[PDB]
């Protein structure tokens, strides 16, 4: 079971309702992948309603790939991604 999903998180203000872990140069979410992963989804928050799932690997934010991104770079991308944030994710 491997799939790629395009999820659109909608917000008026505030956060997306997720936590991300990992990134280049940080402790990985899993030993075999240094990338950005969803470590927590807020109960029935924006991301939850958009269909995000813990363990999802975040490939892109509004068309900008996070391959090779440091943890802070992914954080900045999600914070400044706007009110409609489309995420290409990898789910197993």
């Amino acid at each position: 079971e491997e799939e790629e999903l395009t999820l659109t998180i909608l917000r008026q203000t505030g956060g997306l309702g997720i936590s991300i872990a990992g990134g280049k140069g940080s402790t990985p979410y899993k030993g075999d992948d240094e990338g950005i992963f969803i470590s927590r989804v807020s109960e029935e928050g924006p991301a939850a309603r958009a269909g995000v799932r813990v363990g999802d690997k975040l490939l892109e934010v509004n068309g900008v790939a996070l391959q090779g991104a440091e943890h802070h770079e992914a954080v900045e991308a999600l914070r400044g991604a706007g009110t409609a944030v489309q995420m290409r994710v990898w789910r197993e």
Partner: peptide
């Protein structure tokens, strides 16, 4: 580590 966004 995690960052809430």
């Amino acid at each position: 580590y995690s960052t809430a966004v």
